[PDB]
Symmetry: D2
Subunit: 383 residues, 4 copies
């Protein structure tokens, strides 16, 4: 039992924080106003190390553990206001880089993995369908085995980075008779015949992070582009969602640290009735809730990541962390707005935009109701 | 004890609902997308009756009571998606039309009141200052008595309708030695020398409802433009906020009725895991919370308005209603988004925009912490 | 729309309140300390009118409607501390008197109903079994038709009033192949061969209200003691639970009115740091929550009862009322204890005993999770 | 960063857990039923090590750190149902043993400290007065300096262990002109002339843990019985409350671990509607809340204690831990009762008694509103 960061960990955090503040955050307000995702800036962030995670040196990574990866991303969330860019980068890392590294063949990693790790190629993962969201393993896209590979048909929706991706990590049924066990994973390239990437679909939350639909019309997937074994795609997807839950939770912990600092400063500086508004218990009680949340969920995340690094079973701990972090991110966004009153409406301050950016955290990587189902299953409440 | 609407009340509701659906709601999505407040449409709504409230027939009103006025505005909130336009109209009614009618001299009402009632002139009320929000009676704008009237100096912020108003109902100190008892109210016209109306300041919440700052530099206010008695402006403002709390609460009750209908329909229609998502208790329990909220706060509002119509003391009931309605509007907006999952991000559906539009309800007309202070005082907890 | 009580209603309330304060409450602390249920006092309360409800004059009742019955019981809850005695009386009224009146034959009502209405005979209703609680219609007790009537076998648990009852309203399967449609209802007398009433089983909540198990070993039920039609017992039970939900909710509304008055008085009188503790927002904010709850749930209950009196469908409104009242009763009990601090531990003040008495309200007459299932079904979320 | 216990820590926990299960818990139900605090059993627990904490070997302690002390007490809370006995023991340790060890003179420690450490003498701490609870430093008891020592007059209330104590650690004003800085601490013996210990005052919460009032009528305190320096009693008391907050929080963490295990087992075993009740999301969602609480607050407590052991400032962390643990203990007690339904009323199962035992945790050692004031002050919100 020790709650100090090592010097190595402290350095990883502080280097990422400096990069987020001095490189990504500079000019962020202009990009946010114009709903711009700067792919040149994204590539600098990827190459700096945010697209590396646990990837080995062989492929350009630093062989970071889960806790180190989470610290980097916590720093990113605290230091850069451009949370849409950060979300895009973490989706690429967790849903695309990491499954390719963990399950790809030597051939497939040799062709694509270092390019994803350095951000030379941007990747999108495509699992969700119009009738398969929480019930993801009822997806109906089909990768029908054929001579030389697969014929792919289907439609995927809500695909982060699809309008800017060079490659797609896609999930489809190689055996449509089964659910989880009938899914396989594939890498396909932008521009392959039959791949139709939709136009960006705007949204108010994470508004500069592009997503769209993609449609597959008789795409030929060469055999060598299957990721992992036939029928293992359900497990690959599930594994990538454990990494995703943990890393976006880190982003929102860092965002909550930033929000708390802003909110404390305001509550000390803004006077009404001849005293700082933080002196009224209605005001200070909400700020204390924000502090309690931050301290609790940061510890849950660190323990979940450290257990993983130790080889222990950390999946329930990650589901608990994601459930807490996203709920606390939304609630604390509301509490900050209430602290500021009318001044919260100011687009330059970004407090309403911050709440909008947190609203999808309770949906992404499995909704929080699904996290409860995962925890219930680990607790033995599901048969 | 009776919980049925009279035929008269039912007709008032249904006529307002038809007008909101068939006139205001038609083309609303385009106006909302472009952040347009259509002053021609606003004037049609005002003349239809939304700018009338309790005003007598002498000045073009229908002599509606508080409950009738609330029913009209509940219908407006349920029937039109253009909540920014509705908010603008209700601010004009409650913070400008009603204090002029209730406290204005015969001369001042004869010159201006029917024009406000028919929407020929648009009005903004200006009380809030950079250092006087919740502590509103510490405002520092000064209306220094002089030969012929007053010299007005000061700055007002967060003024709904200021970029489109023809007249301003302004509050300023005629005796800066006192707080509540040193305030007087005045009507001034757009274009009077020394009145500088700021450019619209954008916001994400209620985004097509314009507001800005206004600055007074040595404005001369003629004596006849004081509203009510010298030093009575604190009481006039407070009275107008009771009307405002009740009428915007009605708007958000109607909006919650609309949101609940949309959310129930989706939860019955959207299937995952082979059944409607409403069949999972995590989903249905939130929808039931939305229903419970709607039924409770509608009854609180109706009772508060009816007590007022009966001549009973209704101020605590109105503060309770406003506190409940705005909290429940925000919470139910969050619950609807969680019901829809990824589909909530769709700008055409408007669920995130709905939540944004509800966020200021807990600040406007006195924050909900201030409502608690009002209720605490009525309960005898403030000395 | 009217929120005043009629003179008739006001008189019913005030007469019941006087009886609760001047007759039942006098000496209550001694009975509560000794865990005594005074059957002589219970009979006085029954004869005064608390055992009458909607029963016609023909059988000794006053033909009160649901709202009048609820007002009487609200007064009882506000005026007498002996909530265990009040609960016992209301269980007799709602689960035994009312189904006999509503479904009994002329013969059976002529023999027993006036005696129950005047409290000459005390009744217990017995539906719950060790394996049938929320799933009540899976009860396994069997009333096997035979020449002359039925042979009854089975075991019932959690039976309020069983150690003091003269008659039992019991539910059992006349067709064990079905659930809801296989249940019938019967009246049986204390002392009939094969009826074994268990010894009182102590509890900390409602601690002077006796309950126990009862066992049926080859009881012969004469044909004339069936209540209503063969196979209608599921519907009779369900109907009696609608009356029960509404009347115990009234008791706890009255108890919350009493608790709020006590808590407000203390928060004004108790000083720390040189001021009344109600002046700290942490303290006043909880008291305001208690007030908000009381006003909201009282209105929901009154509307539910009035809709029933009007002939409208009131079952969802009653389920909503019961769910709100019992949750708010428990939460406000907790808030009162927090207001008083160390002084809450005083057995003479009864605040901890009050919380204990409210804890079962969320279980009784169908748990609050089951109320949500009922409301979900009314909302169309259950297929 | 490490979240494993050392072998030493694991052994401390497991030895305390065995002692709580095999010695204290055996026969607990009889003692609880009879409201017995067994002083022979208490002395065995004290001598086993629960009265040692950080005390040095010189005085019979083991020189445990805060985290080790907390682990021992977590084990005690999980392993023994007799929480009243455990509370009594921890009050003796934290409010009496620890301030004597930390501030007593060599002479005073030599005379009394080892006897307290081995439980040969039982101690009560007496700070609270009828008009000084949260405002503790406005206490009015006076220790007026005189030749040879002090003359003590005053009244103390809510004194845990007073009916069974051999010695009293008492706080009184040596300079009544000041608050915090006018308090001194003293040790006095049972039986000294002018000390009147009141009869035990019963309570439903922690019902076998005795407390009473004590009155001082012209007690002579010899000079050598002052604990620490003149005027340092406010600081000694405050320091002892930091130890108390942490150690009773540990007791309630262990109690929550026990409650969760019981509740999970029931939710898997109890069937309704043909499935385990844990399969309904209304049921499993509350159990998941209990799990989330336990994991979060255990980590907060461990970090607070470890920071103290490291020499870092841990007072805010302890206030946060106490606030979380006591709130979560109460809420999870409510959630367990709701899980069990009617079966929660069983006195043998102890679930209602468990909730009663947790209710005072939010009051003791400074109410949770006062904890928020402490945290607000650490956050810079109090001037
Ligand atoms: C910001 C964002 C980025 C995204 N990026 C990607 C991406 O890059 N690639 C990709 O493939 N997908 C992506 N998604 C989609 C995401 O995977 C789905 O939105 C998510 O899994 C939820 O599915 P759904 O939207 O269809 O909601 P539904 O599954 O329809 O859920 C609707 C409601 O039903 C509840 N519900 C459903 N099942 C249950 C159940 N068994 N028990 C209790 N409640 C239940 C849900 O919790 C929710 O409250 C993204 C989503 C978001 C919000
Ligand atoms: C949509 C919108 C439209 C508006 N339109 C108008 C208009 O047309 N005309 C006009 O004059 N103004 C208008 N206002 C301004 C509104 O009156 C103020 O925003 C409101 O009174 C709150 O003041 P403030 O923003 O300065 O917040 P502050 O008063 O600075 O409040 C900051 C925080 O401190 C809390 N706080 C302050 N005092 C206390 C206290 N005693 N006890 C406990 N907590 C306290 C507040 O509740 C809040 O949480 C509008 C505001 C909004 C959001
Ligand atoms: C004070 C008191 C007086 C009583 N008096 C009587 C009396 O006089 N006569 C009589 O016959 N009975 C009486 N009862 C029993 C009462 O009817 C049952 O306790 C009640 O119906 C709950 O059943 P149970 O205790 O078996 O809980 P269970 O049904 O075992 O419930 C355990 C948990 O599972 C939840 N649960 C069960 N099903 C679902 C579901 N489909 N969905 C979601 N959650 C679910 C429950 O809400 C609860 O949280 C009394 C009970 C009490 C507390
Ligand atoms: C189980 C138990 C064991 C105890 N054992 C001992 C013992 O052994 N020795 C001893 O000396 N005392 C003991 N106490 C007393 C304990 O110290 C006091 O009960 C506690 O400090 C609260 O004081 P009070 O009861 O007078 O509540 P009050 O201070 O009257 O509090 C009443 C309410 O006012 C709130 N309040 C007060 N001040 C503020 C404020 N500034 N801001 C916001 N809210 C405020 C409180 O939070 C509470 O909600 C014990 C108490 C308990 C419950
Ligand atoms: O297995 C999981 O973790 C995925 C996430 C979205 C639906 N279920
Ligand atoms: O008196 C009121 O109602 C006003 C509203 C804003 C500040 N206080
Ligand atoms: O139908 C009802 O209302 C009953 C109440 C207990 C179980 N279900
Ligand atoms: O200083 C503290 O920690 C004490 C605890 C009770 C009142 N204040
Ligand atoms: Cl305060
Ligand atoms: Cl469910």
């Amino acid at each position: 039992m020790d709650f100090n960061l090592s010097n190595s960990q402290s350095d990883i955090y502080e280097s990422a924080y400096r990069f987020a503040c001095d490189v990504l955050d500079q000019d962020a307000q202009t990009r946010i106003s114009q709903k711009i995702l700067s792919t040149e800036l994204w590539k600098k962030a990827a190459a700096y190390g945010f697209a590396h995670g646990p990837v080995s040196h062989q492929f350009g990574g630093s062989e970071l553990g889960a806790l180190d990866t989470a610290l980097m991303i916590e720093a990113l969330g605290k230091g850069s206001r451009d949370i849409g860019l950060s979300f895009s980068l973490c989706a690429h890392l967790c849903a695309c880089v990491i499954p390719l590294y963990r399950f790809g063949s030597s051939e497939l990693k040799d062709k694509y993995l270092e390019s994803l790790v350095t951000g030379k190629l941007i990747a999108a993962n495509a699992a969700t369908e119009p009738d398969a969201g929480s019930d993801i393993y009822n997806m109906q896209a089909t990768a029908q085995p054929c001579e030389g590979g697969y014929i792919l048909n289907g439609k995927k929706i809500f695909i982060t980075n699809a309008p800017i991706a060079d490659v797609f990590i896609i999930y489809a049924k190689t055996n449509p008779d089964h659910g989880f066990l009938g899914v396989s994973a594939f890498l396909i390239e932008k521009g392959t015949p039959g791949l139709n990437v939709g136009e960006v679909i705007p949204k108010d939350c994470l508004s500069n992070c592009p997503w769209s639909e993609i449609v597959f019309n008789d795409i030929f997937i060469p055999q060598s582009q299957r990721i992992g074994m036939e029928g293992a795609g359900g497990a690959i997807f599930h594994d990538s969602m454990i990494w995703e839950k943990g890393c976006l939770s880190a982003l929102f912990v860092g965002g909550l640290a930033r929000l708390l600092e802003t909110t404390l400063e305001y509550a000390k500086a803004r006077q009404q009735f001849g005293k700082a508004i933080g002196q009224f218990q209605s005001v200070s009680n909400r700020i204390i809730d924000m502090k309690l949340r931050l301290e609790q969920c940061r510890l849950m995340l660190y323990r979940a990541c450290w257990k993983h690094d130790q080889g222990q079973d950390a999946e329930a701990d990650i589901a608990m962390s994601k459930l807490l972090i996203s709920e606390y991110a939304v609630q604390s966004g509301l509490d900050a707005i209430q602290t500021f009153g009318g001044a919260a409406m100011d687009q330059e301050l970004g407090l309403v935009r911050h709440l909008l950016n947190m609203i999808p955290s309770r949906i992404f990587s499995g909704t929080n109701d699904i996290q409860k189902e995962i925890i219930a299953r680990k607790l033995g409440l599901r048969g």
